[PDB]
């Protein structure tokens, strides 16, 4: 059912479904098998930042994930998202654990969409969360996601003693639909930034965090924990 465009921060190589044999960032267009990936060194317990950038002019969905020591991974993929997404969408963040686990803590998330037509006629949506609240009424939380008093978005279950749990899936979508393209726009652009804290005591962290764009009514697909990152009903 859902149509998904996602940038995944994939901490666990599932080499039997396309993953390269390392942690990676990837651009996912309607499939968990990334159309493009790049090797990503996830820094356990460090606060990372992902930036996702698209414009309809260059038609390049780009993402960069960095940590404070400056190591970064970038992935870009040429794609015309007008042909992929419906005109109205919701944007959100998703994360998973499976057999292995990790905290999928989002510390901030910002997003901007703009449709520039002809002629000083722009429609724009911008939000920025640097602090999430307990009762975050402009966010739709799905599955295991929760917003804490500590001001974070915990996309997957973390135990009272601070421990990430396995087989968790959770997503947070901005409440308002976004008009991410409009056929008379000369420029439809968006950008998204989030900061995250992936920490694991496990033998390996898993499974990752994705920023995604979906149909407005998108919900977690059945059994999308683990390697499917809460975005896809399957690994096709």
């Amino acid at each position: 059912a859902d149509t998904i465009v996602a940038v995944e921060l994939d901490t666990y190589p599932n080499t039997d479904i396309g993953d390269p044999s390392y942690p990676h960032i990837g651009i996912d267009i309607k499939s968990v098998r990334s159309k493009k990936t790049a090797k990503w060194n996830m820094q356990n317990g460090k606060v990372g930042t992902a930036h996702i950038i698209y414009n309809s002019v260059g038609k390049r969905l780009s993402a960069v994930v960095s940590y404070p020591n400056g190591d970064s991974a970038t992935v870009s993929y040429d794609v015309d998202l007008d042909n992929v997404l419906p005109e109205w969408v919701r944007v959100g963040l998703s994360a998973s654990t499976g057999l292995y686990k990790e905290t999928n803590t989002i510390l901030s998330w910002s997003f901007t969409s703009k449709l520039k037509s002809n002629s000083h006629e722009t429609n724009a949506l911008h939000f920025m969360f640097n602090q999430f609240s307990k009762d975050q009424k402009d966010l739709i939380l799905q599955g295991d996601a929760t917003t804490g008093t500590e001001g974070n978005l915990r996309l997957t279950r973390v135990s009272s003693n601070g421990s990430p749990q396995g087989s968790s899936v959770g997503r947070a979508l901005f409440y308002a639909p976004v008009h991410i393209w409009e056929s008379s726009a000369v420029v439809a652009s968006f950008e998204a930034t989030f900061t995250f804290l992936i920490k694991s005591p496990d033998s390996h962290p898993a499974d990752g965090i994705a920023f995604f764009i979906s149909n407005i009514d998108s919900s977690i697909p059945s059994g999308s924990t683990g390697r499917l990152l809460g975005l896809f009903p399957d690994a096709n």
Copy 2:
């Protein structure tokens, strides 16, 4: 039930409920009887712009409505909106006709809310509509409001032949709730701008347009057409 803070562009003097005896802009806090007004020369058939500005520092809700020839009216009112509004709100635009009538056409609407805490931790919501679409999924339309193909928001009924109808009420609220204050914010500010086209063939235009802030579940009060501008169940 609803809690309303509004800036009204009031085209019709209802002198028996507080209006001054002229068209006016006013600041309405939980009552249609404006706490403060200023004489406003509505320019029939011209495109006006209203700007509404509040910050929690100066605690002054300010509004200015202007037309291209530069005539403008300003109203300011000292008020602590933390004590008025709930923490989460919806923001919107409302307009009415009663016995007299006018087009209450909104050509653009923009809004920004920011909560600045301590410490480069800001939450922000910004939207901008310069063109409304027919199926405007990030707007909640109430009552007679409609968004047209022409890219406008018609808050009240306009006849197929372009004529405004009487006894109309309509509102458009942004879909996402807004967090307009948060007690640990050092600055909670917002601003709103809209452009409007009030045209009437009537002996007098009525009744006006308001930008308002309300509880998230706000709906048009019963019999709020006319002088109550779709905001208030009564003239108290």
Copy 3:
């Protein structure tokens, strides 16, 4: 001397120096011979909008020029501007006439540069001119450029009777240097938008308008009127 990156709106095909045999938009990196062009139908006397977009992630300089009837031309070019430009620059607008002529009237110009590092540490510059004033102290006007009372930037000479003159060159650069890249930035992006009105009574319009980025001390090169668009000392 100068280093120039430019998006040109080139109204005159100078086929002996690389131009294609039509009006075109092009991306110029250190040469007037565009690395990339696209056919552009200049609409005489209509107000056009150009949008220029770059990010250091996708490393794609993109431009689109459109008119209100929606005809548009787009050009994109993969390039790493960190390797082209100095770290600090000035940004501006340039236009020329030669043997043929045209008004090169800019009605608005906006620009944003951002350097996003690690870690909610962004440097940003944004300006927007929708109205230029006579004494525009945040603009550096070179050559024939002038800002009028009418609120426009006339990059090339227009006669008192409204007529564009030949052999004119003029540029307007934003006063403050811009830091358009910084090697520790994870994202260095910029965007620029301007609206323009190219009108000509001539047998052909010429020569065009460019948005450019240059070294801070950039000045009009000698004999850069006409086909060199006020950017290049020569056609190499």
Copy 4:
């Protein structure tokens, strides 16, 4: 000569020139004797944030200074800055030490000015420094001010061993002039935010930090160290 509007973070009570007998924030219009002040508990060695807000609608210059534990001081003052400032200005930050001393370290500074006319015609300037660089070409440094490799703006002299020096004055002004009012603007607003770190080993910290607005050619007045905060030739 200079015309100064300033918000001062005044760490040292100079009770013989108007200061109240405590550290205070104040709004200074053409005089170091603040038109309005508020008691401010400066938290030695903590990172503070000041927010300064003005709009020409409400005509209230407002400032709030806060620290992460949430203690804050606010000051507001009704004033029409169109009658005070010239139309074009420079904006900057100033700080002083005298007999007592303190670090006057600025960690970030952001500013926005907007002139909204009639009719989707806004001029705007926004800058944001979250990191200052050594060679900060869009800043004018005066007196003792320096930008470090550490990414801070040290408005006053700090010794190689980290110690603030006495009798220091330094200012940083944004390079481009700002058009802070224009008589046909319906709204002329600005806001400024900076974060600062005032640390002192002294028996008392002194003298403070100001954000100011001045004539474009403003320079440090002779003998404006200490209680005059680098803004005023005297205490009148």
